[PDB]
């Protein structure tokens, strides 16, 4: 009926605690917000189901 809800901090996965990597990750724009948006849409649906 449902599966485990997961959230990710895309910046902590990719760059965890590096400010240098975090400034380089901003060059990609929206991708990390899209990843968090997609996992949030999956997580809300486990409760709906």
């Amino acid at each position: 009926v449902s599966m485990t809800k997961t959230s990710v901090d895309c910046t902590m996965y990719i760059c965890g605690d590096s400010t240098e990597c975090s400034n380089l990750l901003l060059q990609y724009g929206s991708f990390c917000t899209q990843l968090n948006r997609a996992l949030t849409g999956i997580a809300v649906e486990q409760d709906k189901n």
């Binding site: 959230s7 901090d9 902590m12 968090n36 949030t40």
Partner: protein
């Protein structure tokens, strides 16, 4: 400024609907810097 202003920026909107909204993950920042090196003191023989 406050959690509502962060919600407005995360939604890129000056108005927000009824809901619960994911905002930036928090993090306890470091209080001080700790350096730990061996108590070796004698300089290395590079002239030789």
């Amino acid at each position: 400024l406050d959690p509502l202003s962060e919600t407005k920026c995360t939604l890129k909107s000056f108005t927000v609907e009824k809901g619960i909204y994911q905002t930036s993950n928090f993090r306890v920042q470091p209080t001080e810097s700790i350096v730990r090196f061996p108590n070796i003191t004698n300089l290395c023989p590079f002239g030789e």
